[PDB]
């Protein structure tokens with residue numbers, strides 16, 4: 001997918017999570033987030049087009065999606081286990097990851 | 107691209123790390139491995155074609171490559187600071203993750 | 213080698229990061245944490261001595277351990293970038309992962 005569509009999917013589904021009624025809905029938003037973050041991994045952002053793929057910038061760029069995928073995964077488990085409230089909390093906190101990569105490369 | 111191709115890339119570069127000349131050939135081969143493993147992220151292996159993308163088997167499957175990439179990133183950091191022998195050792199012990207997944211899904 | 217020992221190394225270097233002045237001191241302490249975590253993550257802890265390597269309990273433990281490994285990586289990136297203060301904030305931010313895993317498995 002386009003990086004840009006991948007982020008819309010991240011943004012949209014996080015909101016779906018903040019507003020969810022039950023576990024089924026959070027878990028579904030999390031899955032979709034996982035899909036998008038997995039796909040984004042290999043993307044080159046506009047701000048790093050003049051950067052070599054094996055370069056520190058692209059290295060740290062990729063790692064951002066690694067972290068996010070692990071967090072979504074942890075959060076996805078809380079959801080599977082029916083823990084709506086804490087799943088929503090994990091979901092929240094992975095925003096720090098969105099910001100960390102955003103501050104730098106967006 | 108293909109799951110098959112990704113594995114050939116994995117296998118080849120593991121041999122490339124074992125024979126490595128210097129830090130850079132080690133780093134370059136590890137980079138290729140991470141990109142191949144992330145390409146495989148969302149591939150669907152023959153043995154799990156009957157299984158829902160939301161099943162424990164696929165969960166287990168995608169998670170392997172996440173562990174792997176992590177292990178690769180860790181080796182990469184060893185190489186970055188010029189501990190080639192140590193980076194080469196982690197690429198050896200990195201086979202435990204390969205095997206773990208083949209055992210279940212190949 | 214053993215969990216205990218690596219956990220001390222982990223504990224001690226976080227207090228070294230909190231008391232650090234320069235980016236290099238943070239980088240080294242994070243590097244020692246990287247190393248402790250590299251040698252620890254696959255151990256079975258006292259409280260899961262009964263459960264086997266591929267249960268839900270060991271899978272969760274390994275993941276949170278990998279989350280931790282991934283936050284040390286992020287923090288190490290920030291240090292190489294010489295962003296001293298935000299490497300430290302990231303070393304702080306990683307106490308929650310420490311805590312999430314102790315709360316289930318210590």
Ligand code: HEM
Nearest residue numbers: 003004007010011045046061064065068097098101105106
């Ligand atoms: C779930 C967490 C995340 C959310 C909610 C999020 C949200 C967004 C949104 C809404 C945009 C569009 C901004 C615009 O309208 O111009 C965007 C763009 C972007 N994001 Fe994220 N993001 C997340 C995680 C990440 C991560 C982890 C990375 C890097 C590893 C990243 C890298 C980027 C980049 C480079 C752009 C610019 C896209 C472009 O200009 O083509 N984002 N993100």
Ligand code: HEM
Nearest residue numbers: 110113114116117151167170171174203204207208211212
């Ligand atoms: C760097 C470590 C790894 C190496 C060197 C490696 C190597 C290989 C090789 C040589 C094959 C032979 C199949 C062929 O080429 O036709 C294969 C197949 C396969 N591997 Fe891996 N592998 C690794 C890691 C993994 C991991 C981590 C997973 C799961 C997370 C995995 C899942 C599979 C599956 C499902 C197949 C069978 C697919 C097919 O035949 O279409 N492998 N691998």
Ligand code: HEM
Nearest residue numbers: 215216219222223257258273276277280309310313317318
């Ligand atoms: C920076 C992060 C962490 C710090 C500073 C830390 C610190 C410590 C300390 C001080 C101990 C007690 C050691 C002793 O008195 O022998 C300990 C033990 C332990 N830690 Fe951590 N820890 C961290 C992260 C983690 C993580 C991520 C996990 C699992 C994923 C984990 C699992 C355990 C377990 C199971 C023990 C019990 C060992 C025993 O008493 O046998 N820790 N840790």
Ligand SMILES: [Zn+2]
Nearest residue numbers: 073077169271
């Ligand atoms: Zn899991």
Ligand SMILES: [Zn+2]
Nearest residue numbers: 059179285289
């Ligand atoms: Zn790195």
